[PDB]
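PROTEIN DATA CARD
Card holder: a-kinase anchor protein 13
Chain length: 234
Origin: Homo sapiens
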Amino acid sequence: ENLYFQSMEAESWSRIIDSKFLKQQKKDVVKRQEVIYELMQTEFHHVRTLKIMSGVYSQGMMADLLFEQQMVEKLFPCLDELISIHSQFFQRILERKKESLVDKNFLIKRIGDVLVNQFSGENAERLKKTYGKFCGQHNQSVNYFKDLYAKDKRFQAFVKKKMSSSVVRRLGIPECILLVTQRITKYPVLFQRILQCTKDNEVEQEDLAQSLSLVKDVIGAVDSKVASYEKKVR
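Structure generated from the sequence above:
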């Protein structure tokens, strides 16, 4: 789905965190809705970061500097895939908000099934391969970027032009790569905060516990892949 539409759905969600409707629910509900918000908002930022990497930097290198498709895969491996995964994950979350209206005021009573789906079966396998690759090529790409900046004056001009743009916050390529690398390790924390906020709901508590166990398996797999890559690079 479209990024502006995604941002409007996010901005809409956040209006309800500030609302009097929410602030006048029970403390445990306010806290639970506040943590589920955090998961959504940070997933939106992740998707935004990825699409800036792709639409601004990656597309710009090919269009302006005549980089090949392969030189860009060196800097940003599996970027198209990541964008697909996280936009879709982000959609599922919004789709859940849309069916959680009350009596425009909503209250997410159930998000565990969405998380379990995302981190099991072939979705989990896609994340493992995707991040294992991105997180493995991680340090080579940052060095490759820094190598290019110091050497190629045309890339140097390109980067300064981009950082000045209103589109990129002041997101440098190194920062982008670093943010994307971290992301997968954020989920256990966000998921576990939702779980400990969830009271008197058995289905949800079970699914959240499951998703938390599941995302740790993915992280493990990614860490094995990264370790092996680095050993091979030497």
